[PDB]
Every structure is written in C-alpha cells, then in structure tokens.
Amino acid sequence: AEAGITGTWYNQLGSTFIVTAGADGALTGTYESAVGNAESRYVLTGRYDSAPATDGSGTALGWTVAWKNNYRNAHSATTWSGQYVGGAEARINTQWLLTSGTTEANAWKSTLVGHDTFTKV
Amino acid sequence: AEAGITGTWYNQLGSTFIVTAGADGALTGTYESAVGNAESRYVLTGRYDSAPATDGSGTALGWTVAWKNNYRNAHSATTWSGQYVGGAEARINTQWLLTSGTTEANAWKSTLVGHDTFTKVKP
C-alpha cells in the first residue's frame, strides 16, 4: 500500500493530520489537535509497512507527535498505531498512547489510551 | 535531553535500540528485536518533547518501527510511548502497541499491547 495515505485526514474530534508517505515506508507531516493542551501545528514522523500482504488486508503504520512547538510545550507525546484501509471510503483506524512526563511518584498515571478513526471527509 | 537519549539501549527481552536525538526533537535509529517475525535491523523514527521540565520529571517521547526491511516483511508496525529518566542509571519506560494489517473481519484482534523498559549501555 502507500497508495492514498498521502493527504489531509480528519478524525472524530475534528483534528487534522496532513501526511506524505515516501515510497520507502516513511511518513512525515503535521498534526493539529482539536482538543487538549495543544495549539496550531506539530511535527509528526512515522513509518508504514509496504509492501503489505492479496487477502485485502490493511497497511500497518504508526506515527508520533511530541507536543512541543513555538506556541505550547505540553511535556507529552502521543503515538498512534493502526492500519490504513483504502477503497471508496478510506480510513486509518488507530489506537493511541499519550504519555506525559511525570515524577516517579506519578508515573503510574502517566499514560492515556484511546482510539481515533481518520477519513479524508 | 538529546545527549542523554542518544546511545545504545537494550530491554528485558534482549532487543537493541540505537538512537540519536536531534536538537529539533527528532529521533532516528535502528531497532533489532530479539523476538517475533523479525530479523536484522529495522529503521525507526520518533520525536521527544527537546525541552522537558526542572524538575525530576521524565522526558516524554515515542517512536515507530514498521517491520519491513530487505530480509523480512511482517506487515505490522509497533509504536512505543514512554518517558526517559536520565541519571547514573538512565531508563526509558514504555508501553507499546503492535498493529498487524488484517482483513476488516479480523480487525478486532489486530493490536497487541505491552510494556518494555530499556537500560542504556556505556558509552
């Protein structure tokens, strides 16, 4: 795959993901979150496994965003792991982990988990 | 800090992580897994939040590895989210998500979750 991963996608919270997939598995772009201690665009970097497998499977991929930019520094980073499914309606179905930097004392509650579904709609 | 993160790290499974942290919050390197449908090294890219806080908080970061290289293609990708704690014995504590590409029907069992702790080797 790689196919139509490039583009501007949006998730159910109204966040915008603008990405470019390189033919060798790299993903680059920017992220703008509609929620959280975030504002404006953030740099993202990831990878996607091409050469996926005939049995109409999705393409595994993942990316990271460290929430620091020239506007805010939320001392956290999020990683999204999921797969791309194309067709008439293409989607990127993910599960993410958002880790904030804590002291040892609070390390037990440093990580949130959630799921996001992206479309070009 | 970039310097503290740059280096060779190993985790409890015997996997290897070689990374360099750029002043821009970038992370690039290779990962070698001791387990799984993997062989040789794989490229990794990630980011880390460059200006943490003062205090004794960890530095948040995350990176991704798509499990495809010249020797093998597992059709999966793993992302590690965690924090770096420097010091005499520095550690990177993480939780990860491993998604395999599946058909729509099997998408419910596409992701594995786990945690890994990495120890830095001297240098």
Place this chain on the structure above:
Amino acid sequence: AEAGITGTWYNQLGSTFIVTAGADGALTGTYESAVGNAESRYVLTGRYDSAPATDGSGTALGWTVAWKNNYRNAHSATTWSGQYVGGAEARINTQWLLTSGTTEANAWKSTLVGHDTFTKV
C-alpha cells in the same frame, strides 16, 4: 447512575451483553461473542461506580469474562473498562484487554487491546 444499565446490549461486532446492575454497584449477566474462539454464553461479573458525579458525566464500570464454559475453553479472559451514558440513545463506550495464557516465552504477545461501543439497538 445504574439507571438503565440493566438490559440486553449489542456491540458493533454483533456480540450480546445481557446484564443486571444491583443497587450496590454489582454487575452480573452473560456474554455471547459474535467473534473469536467462543460459542454460546459465558458468565460475566463486574462493578459500576454509583453514585457517579451534576456535570452530566458517564458512569464508570467494567466487567470480566473468562472464556471457558461447557462448550469451549479458550484459556483467555477479557476485561472491558468504560462508562455508561444514558439518554435517548444510551451507550456503554469501552476499551478492553484480552489476555491469553502463554508460556513465559510468549508472554510479550499475550494481550490484545480493542474498543467496543454497546447500544440496546
């Protein structure tokens, strides 16, 4: 809350969750999965926090299903953690962990994570 948690709910995979909420926080019932190494009904037990909080929040709850019954024994168990939201369309939004029993060697890949949304529709 507790309100209308009792009932028969269904999720996006077509699984059926039949539960009874006791006024003291207990949840009891049976589960039938439309997918996996499962067949017929399985016993479930859980808890839900009542006395929830005015700011129209959901009610936190969770439950477990060990996948052994008189038909199959899949040597695994799933726990769903989420919150109930009622109203005209009530839903139970969850994230689950499915752990299978492995040898130490395979312990690194014993746990799957996912999300299910239940409705009475």
Place this chain on the structure above:
Amino acid sequence: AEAGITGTWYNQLGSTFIVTAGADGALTGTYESAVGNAESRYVLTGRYDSAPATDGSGTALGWTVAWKNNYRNAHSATTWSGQYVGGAEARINTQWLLTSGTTEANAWKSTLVGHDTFTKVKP
C-alpha cells in the same frame, strides 16, 4: 488453580489484593490501593479461566474494582487483565485500564493504562 490464586498479594506500588477463587471460576475479595483517590478497602469481583492448560502456561484472569465505598467515591473503575503463574514464587502479571466518568467532550482522556505485577505473601 483456585488454591494457588486465593491469598494476599501486593504489587510494586504497595497496594493489597485479597482474593478467593471459587471452583466455578469466580474471584471475590477486596483491594486497597496505595495511590490515587482511594481510601480503605473496595470490593472486587472477577473470573479466571478454572481449567488452564498442562503445561507451563499461565492461567488467564481479570477483575474489576469500582472506586466507591463508604468513605470515598472517585467515580472511576479499574479492570486488571493478566495471567497467574504459580510455583514457589507465584506472580500475577497484569495490564490495567482505569476509566473515569467524564462529559462527552472529555471522553478522549477518560482512560489510563498501566501494568502491575503482584507477589503472593505466605500463607
């Protein structure tokens, strides 16, 4: 096995788990957390898969704790999913999900994820 699981267990944070495993695959007991918006004991209910396999596999199980008792109401619930490994030093290795009740708008940050390892105390 029911007998092996029944007992008092503690985890790395200093929390206490007292449980009894019924021959029907049931688990009942109390949990006391060393951290969080919690105080005193809380009731727990769960299940465990009674007939594991022969082999040196773990026994899968899980339990839930809603964080409400006579002294405090945190409006949250935690579920622990993991496996029991018996032996001279028995352990229960788990991963957990802690969901707080939120408004629809904040539902994206309602769940925390983590892992705990429990060690059995003699008796």
